[PDB]
A paper describes a structure:
Here we report the mechanism of three Fe(II)/α-ketoglutarate-dependent dioxygenases in bicyclomycin synthesis, which depicts the natural tactic to sequentially hydroxylate specific C−H bonds of similar substrates (cyclodipeptides). Three αKGDs (BcmE/BcmC/BcmG) catalyze site- and stereo-selective hydroxylation of inert C−H bonds in BCM’s (bicyclomycin) cyclic dipeptide scaffold, one of the simplest peptide derivatives without additional functional groups. Our hypothesis posits distinct regulatory mechanisms: BcmE employs steric hindrance, BcmC relies on inherent reactivity, while BcmG utilizes a directing group to control C–H hydroxylation. Although these three enzymes share only 35–42% amino acid identities, the overall structures are similar, and r.m.s.d. values are 0.70 Å (SsBcmE vs SsBcmC), 1.07 Å (SsBcmE vs PaBcmG) and 0.87 Å (SsBcmC vs PaBcmG), respectively.
The DKP ring of substrate 2 is locked in the hydrophobic cavity formed by F245, F276 and F288. Two carbonyl groups of the DKP ring are involved in the formation of direct hydrogen bonds with the imino group of W281 and the water-mediated hydrogen bonds with the amide group of N277, respectively. Steric interaction between W149 and Ile moiety of 2 causes the 7-OH of 2 to move upward, forming a hydrogen bond with T170 at a distance of 2.7 Å. Notably, the distance between C-3’ and the iron center (5.0 Å) seems closer than that of C-2’ (5.7 Å), which contradicts the hydroxylation selectivity of BcmC. We speculated that the crystal structure only captured one state of 2, and the single C-1’ − C-2’ bond of 2 is rotatable which could rotate to the state that C-2’ directs to the iron center, facilitating the hydroxylation reaction. This is in agreement with the results of DFT and MD calculations. However, the single-site mutations of F245A, F276A and F288A have almost no effect on the activity and selectivity, probably because the cavity of the SoBcmC is too large to affect the substrate binding and orientation (volume of SoBcmC is 252 Å3, but that of SsBcmE and PaBcmG are 139 Å3 and 210 Å3, respectively). The W149A mutation dramatically reduces the activity, owing to W149 may lock the substrate in the active pocket. In addition, mutagenesis of T170, N277 and W281, which constituted the hydrogen bond network with substrate 2, resulted in the reduction of C-2’ hydroxylation activity (19%–75% conversion yields) but performed the C-5 hydroxylation activity (4%–23% conversion yields) to generate product 2a, which is also the inherently more reactive site with the lowest activation free energy. Consequently, these findings suggest that the site selectivity of BcmC-catalyzed hydroxylation mainly depends on the innate selectivity of substrate 2, in which one C − H bond is inherently more reactive than the other bonds.
Residue numbers in the entry:
A (entry chain B): 3 to 291
B (entry chain D): 5 to 291
């Protein structure tokens, strides 16, 4: 199966500019697109954490020490019983408390790109700016919950890489380097290829619910990581991503066809249903508290 | 465990024993239905204890209840889950299952249709549109599925993938603990109640009623990992489902009460399979 042919965008003076002809219209219909990584970003702190977080703090250099030992942190480390993936998931405060400052710096840059995509999309959908803070639970302006994930795919386990899921928030900005990610398009798993120098952007369940009654609804793509098999001298698969989410204590909104925001359900119960159908393991507070 | 409504049969009417009645059952998305006293459940329990066994060794009487792991059309060995199951529509049951089992399935399917018509009536949906929005399932058409599930305890996995049933109405037989439902975000066990089927609704009922005054939800459920052996036998279950045909469209009652086709059934089912099972049986419940 051939990979998806997605739109490609770049940021130019804080505006989203599309290099491919379909533009933001086609990208929203696809539910995902590639976003050029701003040339000044150093990705190496994120890759370093993805290569080290699951290793013991000792033995090893004192320089790598703040990048290791995270399997001990019950607050932000998640060993998945049924999948190859183990991952850090940390909100803003948790990143500043537990992750190296160069990683925190990288997350802040990725978060700004996620917010840029969010405001571009809301504008593209003709949603009144006056309701942006309310319908995003504050996420649009850097509030809400700004999640970070660092994933390591453990090849020694004969399991699927990542549970099939829809992301739960508004916008995801994802870094990948290896094959393995797939999306459900028309009922068939289509690979999403890594594009060097680009993030992958998609939308989450909160954007799907928000726009489900509009003229051009935006979908949250259903995606998984297939079982990862080691290729000699190729490193284990990893990924890292930031997500702009509504806070778990609030409500999810949906635009009525008359253009009015309606609070339709609580975020926390939505996330709990998500955890139950996606992971179904002991980490029942994952992404909530 | 949940405190569900209980109903029993009475001349082709659904009669509720408990005070919440049909209204509360539709709110819960599930309830217990008394098994008609004349029904023999043993053909179903027998198939559930035999279908995964080799044709031989064993008695010639049990042979038609065995050897289904070689039937590529109706047998599904799950990679990531303890469950292995038969899934057969009407014709396949006719063609591959013992008549005693086909007869029990017909009796369960009739109950599923009784529930479906009681639910469409209780929601005030016009009877003139029943055949259109159910793809013929309300009157015994569409696709009437049967599942026979065996939970392999030697597999150290979840018992059953968490899922919402895909159709309109499910009638399920269980005898052992293990089944759980997601209520208010928490996994709550659904206990086996002797002499009762479990009834719930599927994605098609949820989508159909999502924008009415009293939407009916399709309960999210799973089967925990089944602990290996000691004395008790392996867990099993069997059930029938009234589904829209894969070739049709899923409908939804509008704000004004008129049916609108919102998406195709097959693409709905393929998405379901991809997120629920995510294995090679990509035509499960479609072909
Ligand atoms: C694969 C995993 C690491 C991330 C995955 N994607 C999501 O968007 C959410 C995160 C943001 C938590 C909030 O729900 N949940 C998930 O499971
Ligand atoms: C657990 C399995 C045996 C049955 C389970 N429940 C459903 O309703 C459907 C069936 C009816 C097939 C059509 O989708 N799919 C499922 O996976
Ligand atoms: O690792 C991947 O490619 C997918 C990661 C992902 O889906 C997520 O973090 O939510
Ligand atoms: O085995 C059970 O208890 C549930 C089975 C089920 O959910 C199904 O067949 O759809
Ligand atoms: Cl239900
Ligand atoms: Fe994801
Ligand atoms: Fe089910």
């Amino acid at each position: 199966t051939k990979e998806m042919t997605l739109q490609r965008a770049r940021t130019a003076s804080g505006e989203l500019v599309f290099e491919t002809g379909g533009g933001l219209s086609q990208a929203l219909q696809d539910g995902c697109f590639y976003l050029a990584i701003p040339e000044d970003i150093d990705l190496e702190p994120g890759k370093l954490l993805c290569r080290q977080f699951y290793r013991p703090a000792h033995p090893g250099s004192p320089e790598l020490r703040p990048y290791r030992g995270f399997r001990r942190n019950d607050g932000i480390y998640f060993d998945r019983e049924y999948y190859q993936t183990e991952h850090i998931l940390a909100d803003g405060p948790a990143r500043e408390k537990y992750l190296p400052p160069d990683v925190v710096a990288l997350c802040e840059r990725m978060t700004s790109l996620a917010l840029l995509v969010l405001t571009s999309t809301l504008t593209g959908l003709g949603i009144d700016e006056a309701v942006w803070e309310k319908v995003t639970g504050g996420a649009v302006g850097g509030g809400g919950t700004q999640w970070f994930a660092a994933s390591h795919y453990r090849p020694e386990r004969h399991q699927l890489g990542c549970a099939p899921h829809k992301d739960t928030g508004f916008v995801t900005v994802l870094y990948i380097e290896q094959d393995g990610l797939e999306s459900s398009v028309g009922g068939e798993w289509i690979p999403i290829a890594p594009l060097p120098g680009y993030f992958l952007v998609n939308f989450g369940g909160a954007t799907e619910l928000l726009t489900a009654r509009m003229g051009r609804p935006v979908q949250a793509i259903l995606h998984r990581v297939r079982s990862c098999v080691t290729e000699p001298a190729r490193e284990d698969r990893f990924s890292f991503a930031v997500f702009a989410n509504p806070p778990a204590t609030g409500d999810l909104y949906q635009m009525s066809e008359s253009g009015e925001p309606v609070a339709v359900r609580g975020v926390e119960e939505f996330l709990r249903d998500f955890n139950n159908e996606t992971w179904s393991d002991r980490h029942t507070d994952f992404g909530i508290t």
